Amino acid sequence: THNQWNKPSKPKTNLKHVAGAAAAGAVVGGLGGYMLGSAMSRPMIHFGNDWEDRYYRENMYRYPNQVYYRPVDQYSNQNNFVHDCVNITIKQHTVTTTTKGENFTETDVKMMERVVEQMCVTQYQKESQAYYD
Amino acid sequence: THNQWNKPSKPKTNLKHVAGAAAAGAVVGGLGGYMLGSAMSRPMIHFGNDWEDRYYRENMYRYPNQVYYRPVDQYSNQNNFVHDCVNITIKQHTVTTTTKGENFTETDVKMMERVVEQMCVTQYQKESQAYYD
Amino acid sequence: THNQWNKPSKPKTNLKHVAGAAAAGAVVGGLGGYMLGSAMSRPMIHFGNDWEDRYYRENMYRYPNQVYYRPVDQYSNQNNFVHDCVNITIKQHTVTTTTKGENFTETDVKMMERVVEQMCVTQYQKESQAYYD
Amino acid sequence: THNQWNKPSKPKTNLKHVAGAAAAGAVVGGLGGYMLGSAMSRPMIHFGNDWEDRYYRENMYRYPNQVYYRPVDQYSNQNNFVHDCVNITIKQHTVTTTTKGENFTETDVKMMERVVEQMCVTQYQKESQAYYD
Amino acid sequence: THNQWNKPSKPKTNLKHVAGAAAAGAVVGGLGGYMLGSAMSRPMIHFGNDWEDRYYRENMYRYPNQVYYRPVDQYSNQNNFVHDCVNITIKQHTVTTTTKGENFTETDVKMMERVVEQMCVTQYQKESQAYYD
């Protein structure tokens, strides 16, 4: 005689990133093995009734994380790498100028004058030489 | 005699990224193995009644993550890489200018003058030489 | 005698990205293996009654993630890569200018003057030489 | 004697991306293996009654993710890559100018003057040389 | 004696992208294997009663994801690639100009003057040379 009663009430299970081998990153450079590994986990969750007898569940399991990293020649030369710019502003708030007078002679008013040339990146590669064999 | 009763009430199961080997990233450079791994997990979830006997579930499992990384020649030369620009603004809020007078002589008013030349990227590659064999 | 009762109530199962090997990324560069892996997972979910006997479920499973990365020659030279621009604005809000007078002589008013030349990308490739064998 | 009762109530199952090997990404560069993997998962979901006996379900399964990456020669030279532009605006809101007077002589008013030359991309490839064998 | 009762109530099953190997992406460059993998999954869903005995379901399954990537020669030279433009506007809202007077002499009013030359793409390929063997 075997009786199994299962009455869960509002089982709320949330799983965002369980065993996902996800590579979410910016690679601006290079010559690099990114996320060479895998995901071989067993996030077991048990909540109900169980009953087992005279069995053979698992045996001779083999999960070797064998990584062979043998880069022979790798060259990264004369490189200019820039990743991010964030919130680069130039503000002139409430710029008030009053030039009053009588029988005067205004000559030159330049409220701005070449205030900025470059803001984020001015990457230059001038007369750069590289030799190999 | 075997009896199995199963009465779940509102089982809310949410699964966003369980075992998805997802490569979601920007690769501005190169010569790099991106997301070479896989996903071989077993996110087991059990909530109901179970009953087993005299069985042979699993055996001789083999999950070796064997990665062979052998890049022979890799060259990244004379490179200018830029990834992101975010919120690059130049603001002139409430610019008030009053030029009053009587029998005067205004000559030159330049409220702006070549304020910016470049903002994000001015990538130049001038007279760059590379030699190989 | 075997009895199995199954009365689930409002089973809400949501699955967005379970085991999908999805490559969702921007590759502006190159010469890189993107998302070389696969998805071989078993996200098992059990909620009902189970009953098994004298069986042979799985055996001799082989899931080796064997990745062979052997790039012989890879060249990335004289490259100018730019990925993103976001919200690049130049604003002139509430620009008020009053030029009053009597028997005066206005000569030159230039409220703008070549304020910007380039904004996002000015990628130049001038007199760049590359030699190979 | 075997009895199986199955009375689910409002089973709402939602599945957006289960095991779809979907490559959804922009490849502006090149010479790169994009989404070389597959999808061979078993997202098993069980909710009803089960009853099995004296069977042979699975055996001798072989799911090796064997990827052979052997690019011999790959060249990416003298390249100018740009991906995205977003919300590039130049605004002049509420530009009010009053030029009053009596017996005056206005000469030149230029409220705009070549404010921008290029906005997103000015990709130039001038006198670029490449030699191979 | 075998009895099977099946009375589901409002089974709402939604499946958007289950196991579809769909390649939905823009390839502006080239020389790249896009979505070389397949979809060989088994998203099994069970909700009804089951009863089996003395069977042989599956055996000797072989699902190797064997990908052979052997590009011999690949050249991408002197390329200018641009992907997207989004919301590139130039606005002049509420531009009010009052030029009043008595016995005056207006000479030149140019409310606009060659404000923009190019907006999105000015891809130039001038005097670019390439040699091969």
Numbering used by the authors:
A (entry chain E), B (entry chain B), C (entry chain A), D (entry chain C), E (entry chain D): 94 to 226
Publication text:
The normal cellular form of PrP (PrPC) typically exists as a glycosylated, glycophosphatidylinositol (GPI)- linked, membrane bound monomer with a largely α-helical C- terminal domain and disordered N- terminal domain. In contrast, PrPSc is multimeric and when purified, at least, usually takes the form of amyloid fibrils with ordered cores that are high in intermolecular β-sheets and loop structures. This aggregated form of PrP is able to grow by refolding PrPC and incorporating it into an ordered, transmissible assembly. Prion strains are infectious isolates that when transmitted to a given type of host exhibit characteristic clinical phenotypes, neuropathological lesions, survival times, and PrP deposition patterns.
Here we report a 3.2 Å resolution cryogenic electron microscopy-based structure of the 22L prion strain purified from the brains of mice engineered to express only PrP lacking glycophosphatidylinositol anchors [anchorless (a) 22L]. With helical reconstruction techniques we obtained ~3.2 Å resolution for much of the a22L fibril core with stacked rungs occurring perpendicular to the fibril axis at a spacing of 4.75 Å. All a22L fibrils sufficiently isolated for tomographic analysis (n  = 41) had a left-handed helical twist. Residues 94–226 comprised the a22L fibril core, forming major N- and C-terminal lobes. Several general features of the a22L core were similar to those of the 263K, aRML, and wtRML structures: a PIRIBS-based architecture; an asymmetric fibril cross-section spanned by a single monomer; N-proximal (N), middle, and disulfide arches; a steric zipper between the N-terminal residues and the head of the middle arch; and preferential exposure of cationic sidechains in the amino-terminal half and anionic sidechains in the C-terminal half of the cross-section. In the N-terminal lobe, the backbones of the a22L and aRML structures can be overlayed closely from residues 94–110 and 133–152 that form the steric zipper between the N-terminal residues and the head of the middle arch as well as the base of the N arch. Among the more notable differences are in the respective heads of the N arch, in which the trans side chain orientations of two pairs of adjacent residues (Val120 and Val121; M128 and L129) are reversed with respect to the polypeptide backbone between the two mouse strains. Notably, the a22L and aRML disulfide arches bend in opposite directions, yet both form a more acute angle with the N-terminal lobe than was seen for hamster 263K. Thus, variations in shared conformational motifs within a parallel in-register β-stack fibril architecture provide a structural basis for prion strain differentiation within a single host genotype.
